Amino acid sequence: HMSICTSEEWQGLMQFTLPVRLCKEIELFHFDIGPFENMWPGIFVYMVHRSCGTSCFELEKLCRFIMSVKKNYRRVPYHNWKHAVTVAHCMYAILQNNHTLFTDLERKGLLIACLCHNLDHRGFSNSYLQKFDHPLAALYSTSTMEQHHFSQTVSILQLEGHNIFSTLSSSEYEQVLEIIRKAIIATDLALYFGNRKQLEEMYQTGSLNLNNQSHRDRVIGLMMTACDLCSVTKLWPVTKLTANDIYAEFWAEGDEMKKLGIQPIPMMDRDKKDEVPQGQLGFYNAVAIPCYTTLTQILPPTEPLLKACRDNLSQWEKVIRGEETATWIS
Ligand SMILES: Nc1ncnc2c1ncn2[C@@H]1O[C@@H]2COP(=O)(O)O[C@H]2[C@H]1O
Ligand SMILES: [Mg+2]
Numbered sequence: 456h457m458s459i460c461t462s463e464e465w466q467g468l469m470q471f472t473l474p475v476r477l478c479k480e481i482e483l484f485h486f487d488i489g490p491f492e493n494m495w496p497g498i499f500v501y502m503v504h505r506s507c508g509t510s511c512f513e514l515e516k517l518c519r520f521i522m523s524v525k526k527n528y529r530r531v532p533y534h535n536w537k538h539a540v541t542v543a544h545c546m547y548a549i550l551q552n553n554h555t556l557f558t559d560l561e562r563k564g565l566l567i568a569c570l571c572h573n574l575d576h577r578g579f580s581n582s583y584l585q586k587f588d589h590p591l592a593a594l595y596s597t598s599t600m601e602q603h604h605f606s607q608t609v610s611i612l613q614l615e616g617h618n619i620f621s622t623l624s625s626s627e628y629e630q631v632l633e634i635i636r637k638a639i640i641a642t643d644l645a646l647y648f649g650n651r652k653q654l655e656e657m658y659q660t661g662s663l664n665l666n667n668q669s670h671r672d673r674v675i676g677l678m679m680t681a682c683d684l685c686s687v688t689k690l691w692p693v694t695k696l697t698a699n700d701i702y703a704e705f706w707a708e709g710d711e712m713k714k715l716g717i718q719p720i721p722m723m724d725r726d727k728k729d730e731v732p733q734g735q736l737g738f739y740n741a742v743a744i745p746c747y748t749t750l751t752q753i754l755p756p757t758e759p760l761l762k763a764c765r766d767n768l769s770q771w772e773k774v775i776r777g778e779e780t781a782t783w784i785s
């Protein structure tokens with residue numbers, strides 16, 4: 456079932472205090488949690504506290520929840536614990552910069568959803584699971600892994616002393632689970648294209664209405680896409696190192712397909728590394744840029760994410776022109 460953290464782990468987290476220098480840097484969109492590994496769990500506690508309040512969650516349960524969540528992420532190159540905290544931080548920055556647009560319930564729901572959005576990911580895409588008729592694909596027809604992630608999230612909430620949302624009234628509890636369910640399902644990039652087109656149409660015609668729940672859900676879904684893809688909004692060196700991880704996981708999937716007599720797409724073929732630059736260019740133009748463009752239109756304060764994404768697009772074009780540099784990989 457769900458692995459549970461040790462007492463030394465959650466008890467230790469309770470004693471964590473974010474270093475003063477970081478309190479400032481953590482508020483900016485470009486912040487990279489990368490050089491602070493031992494602090495990731497504590498950084499998440501900190502964001503929840505600043506955004507939701509010191510007493511929003513019983514500290515003990517929060518720390519147990521966080522450490523058990525960390526324990527249930529796998530040792531894969533990309534969809535791991537590091538990614539979870541990175542996505543949660545982007546959400547934190549978005550919420551901080553648009554604080555009163557979102558209810559207390561949605562903020563706590565969204566930060567938790569981001570921390571658990573890829574829970575128990577095994578390193579295999581929906582394409583893989585569905586093409587090899589894996590049990591998960593049978594259980595979950597569409598958004599296969601995303602539905603699994605949500606199921607895992609609730610499972611962890613049900614562990615003894617892990618339910619941070621239990622003090623919520625019966626209706627708010629149901630509400631927060633729905634916010635979390637929709638948010639995590641929104642990370643299925645397949646759904647992003649339609650969501651973005653709908654929001655773009657709503658925004659341009661003037662139909663967009665944040666008081667309209669159906670509209671709210673779409674905005675939140677886009678925010679989720681924005682946070683999931685946030686590596687393209689970090690300083691170039693950071694963006695490049697993360698791209699290496701993204702491909703390490705995709706190539707591993709490609710190697711498995713080969714072993715089973717199925718050739719993988721170029722992107723998952725480690726024998727086609729030369730096409731990465733062009734592949735990323737395609738991704739920014741078809742996905743990232745449109746995403747941050749629409750998000751900025753709806754939530755002006757998120758403007759920095761679009762500016763950063765555009766700067767990285769420019770770096771990939773520079774790579775393609777034959778003006779690359781500094782090649783360091785751990
Ligand atoms: N540089 C990139 N960063 C993030 N996602 C990427 C990138 N390039 C391609 N993608 C795709 O975008 C998807 C985002 O969600 P996933 O992690 O499920 O899978 C990712 C890949 O299929
Ligand atoms: Mg995912």
Ligand SMILES: [Zn+2]
Binds near residue numbers: 572
């Ligand atoms: Zn993710």
